[PDB]
Amino acid sequence: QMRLPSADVYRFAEPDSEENIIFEEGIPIIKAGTVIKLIERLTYHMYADPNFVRTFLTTYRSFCKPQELLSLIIERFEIPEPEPTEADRIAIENGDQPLSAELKRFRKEYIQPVQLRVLNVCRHWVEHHFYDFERDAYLLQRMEEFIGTVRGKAMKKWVESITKIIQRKKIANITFQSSPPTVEWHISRPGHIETFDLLTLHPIEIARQLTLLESDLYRAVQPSELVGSVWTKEDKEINSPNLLKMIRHTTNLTLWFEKCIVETENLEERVAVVSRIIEILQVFQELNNFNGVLEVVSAMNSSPVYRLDHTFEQIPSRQKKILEEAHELSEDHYKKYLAKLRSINPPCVPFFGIYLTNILKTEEGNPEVLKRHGKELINFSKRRKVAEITGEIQQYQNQPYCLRVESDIKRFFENLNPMGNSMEKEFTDYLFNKSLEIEPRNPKPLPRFPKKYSYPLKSPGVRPSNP
Amino acid sequence: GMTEYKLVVVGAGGVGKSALTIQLIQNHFVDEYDPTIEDSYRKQVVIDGETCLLDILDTAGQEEYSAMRDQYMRTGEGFLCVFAINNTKSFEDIHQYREQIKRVKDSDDVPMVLVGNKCDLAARTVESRQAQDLARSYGIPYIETSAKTRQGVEDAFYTLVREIRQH
Amino acid sequence: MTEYKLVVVGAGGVGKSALTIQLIQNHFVDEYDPTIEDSYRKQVVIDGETCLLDILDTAGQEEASAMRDQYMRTGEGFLCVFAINNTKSFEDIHQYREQIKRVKDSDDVPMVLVGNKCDLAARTVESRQAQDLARSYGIPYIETSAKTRQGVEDAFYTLVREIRQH
Ligand SMILES: Nc1nc2c(ncn2[C@@H]2O[C@H](COP(=O)(O)OP(=O)(O)NP(=O)(O)O)[C@@H](O)[C@H]2O)c(=O)[nH]1
Ligand SMILES: Cc1cc2nc(N)n(Cc3ccc(F)c(Cl)c3)c2cc1C
Ligand SMILES: [Mg+2]
Numbered sequence: 001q002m003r004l005p006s007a008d009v010y011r012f013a014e015p016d017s018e019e020n021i022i023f024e025e026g027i028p029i030i031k032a033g034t035v036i037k038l039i040e041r042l043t044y045h046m047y048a049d050p051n052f053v054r055t056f057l058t059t060y061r062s063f064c065k066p067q068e069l070l071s072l073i074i075e076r077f078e079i080p081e082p083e084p085t086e087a088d089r090i091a092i093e094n095g096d097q098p099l100s101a102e103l104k105r106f107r108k109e110y111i112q113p114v115q116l117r118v119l120n121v122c123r124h125w126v127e128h129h130f131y132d133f134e135r136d137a138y139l140l141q142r143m144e145e146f147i148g149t150v151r152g153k154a155m156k157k158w159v160e161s162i163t164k165i166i167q168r169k170k171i172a173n174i175t176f177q178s179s180p181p182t183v184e185w186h187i188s189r190p191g192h193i194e195t196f197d198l199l200t201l202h203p204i205e206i207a208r209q210l211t212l213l214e215s216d217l218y219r220a221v222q223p224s225e226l227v228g229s230v231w232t233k234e235d236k237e238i239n240s241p242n243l244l245k246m247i248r249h250t251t252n253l254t255l256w257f258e259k260c261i262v263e264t265e266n267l268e269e270r271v272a273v274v275s276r277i278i279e280i281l282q283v284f285q286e287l288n289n290f291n292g293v294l295e296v297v298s299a300m301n302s303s304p305v306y307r308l309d310h311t312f313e314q315i316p317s318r319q320k321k322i323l324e325e326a327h328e329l330s331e332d333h334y335k336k337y338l339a340k341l342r343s344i345n346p347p348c349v350p351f352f353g354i355y356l357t358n359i360l361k362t363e364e365g366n367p368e369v370l371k372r373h374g375k376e377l378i379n380f381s382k383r384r385k386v387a388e389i390t391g392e393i394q395q396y397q398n399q400p401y402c403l404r405v406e407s408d409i410k411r412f413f414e415n416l417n418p419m420g421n422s423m424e425k426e427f428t429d430y431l432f433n434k435s436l437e438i439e440p441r442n443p444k445p446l447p448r449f450p451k452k453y454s455y456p457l458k459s460p461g462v463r464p465s466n467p
Numbered sequence: 468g469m470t471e472y473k474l475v476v477v478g479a480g481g482v483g484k485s486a487l488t489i490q491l492i493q494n495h496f497v498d499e500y501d502p503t504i505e506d507s508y509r510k511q512v513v514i515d516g517e518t519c520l521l522d523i524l525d526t527a528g529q530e531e532y533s534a535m536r537d538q539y540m541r542t543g544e545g546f547l548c549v550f551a552i553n554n555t556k557s558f559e560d561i562h563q564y565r566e567q568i569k570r571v572k573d574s575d576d577v578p579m580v581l582v583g584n585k586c587d588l589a590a591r592t593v594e595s596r597q598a599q600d601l602a603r604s605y606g607i608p609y610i611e612t613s614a615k616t617r618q619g620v621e622d623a624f625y626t627l628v629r630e631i632r633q634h
Numbered sequence: 635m636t637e638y639k640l641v642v643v644g645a646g647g648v649g650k651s652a653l654t655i656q657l658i659q660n661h662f663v664d665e666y667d668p669t670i671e672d673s674y675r676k677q678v679v680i681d682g683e684t685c686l687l688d689i690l691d692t693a694g695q696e697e698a699s700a701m702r703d704q705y706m707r708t709g710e711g712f713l714c715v716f717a718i719n720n721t722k723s724f725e726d727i728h729q730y731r732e733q734i735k736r737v738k739d740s741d742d743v744p745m746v747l748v749g750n751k752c753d754l755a756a757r758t759v760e761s762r763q764a765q766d767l768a769r770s771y772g773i774p775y776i777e778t779s780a781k782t783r784q785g786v787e788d789a790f791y792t793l794v795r796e797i798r799q800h
Contacts, residue, residue, distance in 0.1 A: 026707060047704040050673035050690070108700050116698060120670040154697050161667050174660050175783050232481040232528060247531040254534035294535075301538035303570045330538070333508060333524070342635060345679035353529040358502045360528035365489040365500025385501065395675045398658050424533065425563060432570065 002110055003102075005080045012040045012076055019373045024381065032370045032377035035064055039072050043117040045110045051391075053121060057129045058223050058390055059383035062368065066132045066139055074146055077118045079111050112154055119158050122147060126162065130169050131224050140166075180404040182467070183208075186460050196412045198260045200455065203276055204462050207283030207292065209409040210253065212401055214291050214349050217246035219397045221352070223390040229360050246352065250295055255427070256418040257299035261308070262434040265449035270438070271314045272457040274300075278319045279462045281326055287401075288348035290329070290341065297326050304435035310446060311439070347399040359389050469511075471520040472628055475543030477568070479560050480530035482551035483586025486614035488525040491624055495617070514625050521624065540571045545578040545631045547623060550598075552611070553589045558598070565605065578630040579607055582623050586614040635677070635684045638797050640790065641705055643730045644715035645723035646694030649750040652780035653715065654691045657790055662781050668695050671705065680791050687794065706737040711744035711797040713789060716759065718749045718777065724759045731771060744796035745773045748789050753779040 004013040014020065014036070021033040027047050030038070042056050060069060081103060088098035122143065126133065133140040144166060150159045186202035188195040198206075220242040225231060231240035257277055264270040277296055284292035299305060300323060312320075329337040334354055341350060366382040419427045439446065478484045489500055492510050501507060510521045526539050540546070548564050550557040561581065568577050581602040583593060595611060602609035608626050612619035642650045651672070652663045658674045672691040677684065690705055706712075714730050716723040727747070734743055747768040749759065761777065768775035774792055778785035 048671045048701065050671050054673070112697075113701050116670050116701070123670065157668050157695055157697065158670060165667060168665075173662070175656070175662065176660065177783055229528070232530070234481070236481075244531060251532060251534045258534075298532075298535045298538045301541055302534065303537050303567075306537070306541070307573070333505065335505075342677070343684050345684070346677055353526065353532055353535070356528035357526055361485055361489060361500060361502035361507075364483070364485045364527075365493065365498075365502070367498050385503075391675070395677060398676070400660055 002106055003082065004110075005082070009080055011036055019375050020377070022370070022372065022377060029384075031381045032372070032379050034375075034377060035072065038378060038380060039069075039076055042121060043073070043076055043114050045113045045117075048117065048120075050120075050124075053124050054128070054391065055384055055387035057121070057124055058387045059227055062228060062383070063378045066136060067142075070139065070142055070146070073118050073121055077115055077150075079114060081111070082106055115155060116158065119147075119150075119155060119162065123158070123162050123165065126166050126169055129224075131222070133169075140170075174400050176402050178402065180402045181464055183404055183406050184460075184465065187455050191408065193408045193412060196409065198256075198273065199276055199453065199457065201409060201412075202460060203279045204283055204460075204464060205406065205409060207280045207287065207289070207462075208403050209406055210280075210292055210413055211284065211287045211289040211349065212403055212405055213410060213413055214246075214249065214289060215347065215401055217242070217249055218291065218349050218352065221246060221393070221397075223394070226356075226359055226390055226393075227386060229363050231356065232360060243352070250291060252416055252418060253292075253295045253413075254298045254302070255431075256416055257296060258302050258304055258431055259418045261299070261311075262304050262431055262438060264452065265438050266451045267310055267314070267438075267446075267449070269451055269453055269457060270308075270311050272459075274311055274315060275319060276459055278315070278323055279459060282322055283462050285322075285326065288344045288346070290337065290351045291349045293326050293329065294351050297323070297330065301327070302431075304431040307435060308439050346396060347401045348396060350393070350396050352393075355389055355393055359386055362386050362389070469519050470517075471522055472545060472631055473543045474521060474523045474545050474547065474624065474627060475540055476523065476525040476527070476547045476549060477536070477540065477564050478547075478549030478582075479551070479554065479557035480527065482554045482557050483584055483614045484549045484551075485525060485527035486586065487547070487549060487582065487584060487612060487620060487623065488523050488527075490614070490617045490620045492523065512625075514628050519628065521628070523624075536567060537571050540568055545580075545627045547580055547582050547627055549582045549584055550593065551586050552583045552591045552593045552595075552598075553585070553587065555592050558583075558593045558601075561601065576634070578627060578634050580623060580627045580630060581605070581607055581609045582619075583609070583611045584614055585612065635686050636798075637686045637688060638794055639688050639690070639708055639710040640713065640793055640797075641690045641692060641709035641711070642713045642715060643692050643702075643734075644694055644713075644748075645717075645720070645726040646696070648694060648715050648717040648720065648723045649778075649780045650694060650713075650715050651691050653713075653748070653750060653778060653786060653789070654689055656780045656783060656786050658689070660783075669693050670698065671701075678791075680794050685794055687790070689790075702733060703737050706734050709734075710800070711746075711793045713746055713748055713793055715748040715750050716764075717751045718757045718759045718764075719751055719754050721758050724764065727767070742800070744793060744800050745771065746789055746793045746796070747771065747773055747775045749775065749777040751779060751781075752777040752784060753781045 007014045021037040022031045023029060024031045027049060030041060042052060084092065084098055084100065085102050088100055091098040133143065147159055147162050184202040184205045187200040222242065225240040225243045230236060231243050236244065260273055261270060264273045281293060281296040284296065329340060337351065362382065362385045367379055369376045370379050438449065476484065476488055492507060493500060508523050512519060512521055524539060524542060529535065546568050548561050550561055568579065569575060581598060583598045599609050608630065610619055610623040610626055612623055642654055644650055646668060647666060651669050654674060655661060655663050658676055669691055670693055674689045674691065676687040678687060690709065692705055712734055714727055716727050735741060747764060749764050765775050776785050776789040776792060778789050780786065
């Protein structure tokens, strides 16, 4: 086994003990440790663990400042070389070239792997966690300096590469290669944005364009918006803007569905509206857009809509079944949703809410540190649990949809604003009052209302066409 | 089998709401938690001599999905309405949560308890007398809990189960 | 769902990372940023069964040659990649094959031989030559382009099938 530098000149050579590292019960899994031990294992000479690097870089800010992390890995990089051994000494004294066997081994099996793994931390940091550097220009200067002054031919290729990667990141296309299906049109024709509405756009294309929009919103959310539960805190608009944009879209679509339903006073027309919404749900299911699925289900379970017995009675049985199957995804703490998500073939759009609750509860329900033998150790298993969730999120962010954007329909849904200038409570009360108007509480009898739509109500259906 | 109660936790986000259910379901003597596994929100308890099963829905973290509240609330037979005693806005929010629960359940008399949660050592801004008066005006129990010491946590949930049993 | 540990190996610059990123993101990487060690995950349905692929993307530069044993121990299957316009990378294949067998102490390790950059006309390694080698190893040979996607799913999912039948 290789001898190490003295722990006095090089801090990362301290022997493992339960006072500085605790393992979980073919590489070890770390339950807790000092920062020094975490960094040693982050850059361990015996094995690589790129997943550990992702976990660490995603979650470290809860126990180490970015400036301090950089100081520590630079310290890790600077490894002293051992002096010549007795055999080398004797060779040198006789004017011969020493074999330097121990030195060569230490360079090859300790220094070069540890240094390369420090550089891999720097590479991952810059490529996937660049916000540290966006938010602290001095941190970036320090990284540029460190990388730019690493000498020696062994590291040279990666040093030159990481220098270029940093420069690219500072100033900063899909193959399928089957073509996307043809865009489908119903009553509203291309370019006639003024007529776009729930019933005039093709239900297939409504679902497709919402899926592209909701996929883009899903794919834009970074772990920085999630770790530390920052989307729930005072500065959430600063720290979690992509997440909040995503959630607000979902909320607005749900409210739009409710509004379309309760503002359609005529029973027959309202049945057509609900039936069209369930057709859109069916296409969401086909596209694996689970956010879209739950947008619809949330609308149908809302107070204004849920109580509309006369409308429900006229919905075709096959659509009742579709809605029921969709709702059952959410039953028993999303048991069937979770199984379905894990079984489909991506691309998909997950429901984000579950991830948020699990991240928040993991962070709230586990201690930052473990106290052992008089020492405070960083609770790393807590951070690993958070990173397993952010890792799952990222895994579903990779696969793009093979669907063509329609710029006008996209804009129409980007600009949807069912609440107008009203506050939430005011709008929400309005919707419920509309519900009460169109279908009064028993024993009040059911009124009749005039029709509002001048165009045909018959759906073109949700099976795609192909000339 | 035994009776199972579907309990739902509601209240403002960002002020330690999640500690209530976590402290209950937890351990209850080793501070750790994996919300990912079922039985992280199901718990068998004995209340007034009768064994029952608690199923608790706490969607803490999903507060911005405001149009999903009806759907989540619909699943429950009893409700804990939680505010933080150092956050007046969360206390002022309670009225709308209660109104929303009544609407979803279509009833003026839904089993619920008001819970004032102490989530840190920051200064209290809602006096217990304020919260008592509000609870009395609603005809419901008031329980104060600590997010750190587990104090009041069993009382909050057991009291709600009693409100359900006596409905 | 079963989890599969795939490892991509071969000489520097043959396109190991470009292949992996094309599979993961459907995107072609034009830049040549030498890898140290990267990890990717992909949920995918193969032959009707949902799989979770863990893909380890490794270093081809010789300066990293002393660090291969560690990832070879964990891998369940190996994509052995050369470039069809680079004869030396083809000659480097046999060293990876032997080391993998050495490390796992087995003659029966799931592998696929991959001839990458098949979009380029200037070929210097003939298909027959690579095919002969693959047969001597008892493994399939698939020509790929990370640029056009030609053969990319076939190479990775063929490796999954071999692990599955192992
Ligand atoms: N024309 C063409 N170029 C390709 C193809 N695959 C990779 N390249 C190019 O070849 C170069 C090397 O790619 P890269 O994926 O980095 O190779 P690597 O094997 O991962 N290198 P390393 O071992 O150092 O990490 C890049 O410029 C890349 O764009 C391919 O199929 N066709
Ligand atoms: C699973 C499920 C079952 C339902 N049964 C009723 N009555 N609703 C409400 C409702 C009102 C008016 C409609 F037109 C419809 Cl279709 C549905 C339900 C909603 C859901 C999500
Ligand atoms: Mg590479």
